Amino acid sequence: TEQMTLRGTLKGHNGWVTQIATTPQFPDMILSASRDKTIIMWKLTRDETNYGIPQRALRGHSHFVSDVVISSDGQFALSGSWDGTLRLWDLTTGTTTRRFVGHTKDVLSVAFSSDNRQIVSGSRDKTIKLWNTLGVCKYTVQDESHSEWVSCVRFSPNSSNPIIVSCGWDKLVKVWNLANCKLKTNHIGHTGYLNTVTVSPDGSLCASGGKDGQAMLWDLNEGKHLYTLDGGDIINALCFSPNRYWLCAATGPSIKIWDLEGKIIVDELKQEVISTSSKAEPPQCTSLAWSADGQTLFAGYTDNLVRVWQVTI
Amino acid sequence: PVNYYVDTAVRHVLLRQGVLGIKVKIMLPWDPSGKIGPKKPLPDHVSIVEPKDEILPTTPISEQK
Fold first, then answer.
1. A7-313 carries CATH number 2.40.110.10
2. For chain A, domain boundaries
3. Which of A45, A65, A91, B39 is the most buried (most CB within 10 A)?
């Protein structure tokens, strides 16, 4: 079966990498966020000396940047921050065209709609919130929301079932109808708080995880439970492959992949030892992205680096 | 905190042998709203909210509206 190998590393940051984002429109570009308050745009290269260079940096947020996402045309990017404000960036000039305001705490995740005509967000303020791209808020979920911090929000990629999924510190996963503005279904099972939720590109399955170290699968349209996978110590991020039936997870200092035909671990990715006089000797992995080609993986870390892996035979 | 938790007065009284002094000081109770005392707490009085009503066991289930 297929096996990963280390390609190279990217060095231009002064705090933990918080997220990475990519598109099929520009395969020599990637974009990433950090606790150093700024978003970096990278020029990738196939040169033997170093795999990429910081090309531009976006500087307008006043605390940490928590989430970042790119428009399907590759012209614009959207981001949230621990300063409680949400911003839309023109990637050609490196300037914000609009600013979104109306949360009263601290913003943990954001997404674009699959048509890119609507925006959604989640926060420590306990409210999910919906926005028009002209910067005006359109609905607020309030009493039916999570009882604790809203950790994540995501859209289904398909057009024929317009719904969103979410996870929170009250250890529930919830599913919501877009046009009707209402809750559809709870899912219950996890013992710890939740860090992440994700959906397969065919629009069929969820995955979710957090402190309990378990990845659990769920149906989007059949409304029911599927099998549980033990990850290890903790789950920081999850993603599906774009062209294989694989789930991938970032788990403490290591990254891991499951082949879902026959439910088996393909490989686990680890770091060369730097001897350290304390517990948690290695730095942890914080975020993942597969390239639009599917053949290469980007991963971010608490040691201010992005590490790149290829597939091999 | 002395500027809002302590109430004070000083007075004189004249008796046949001369003047005596009186001084009075009172320390007020904290009153969150009601005007018996100040609404602002003392600077080193931290208080912790109690955890409630959790269930320890779980098993995976789904619940539609």
1. no
2. 7-313
3. A65
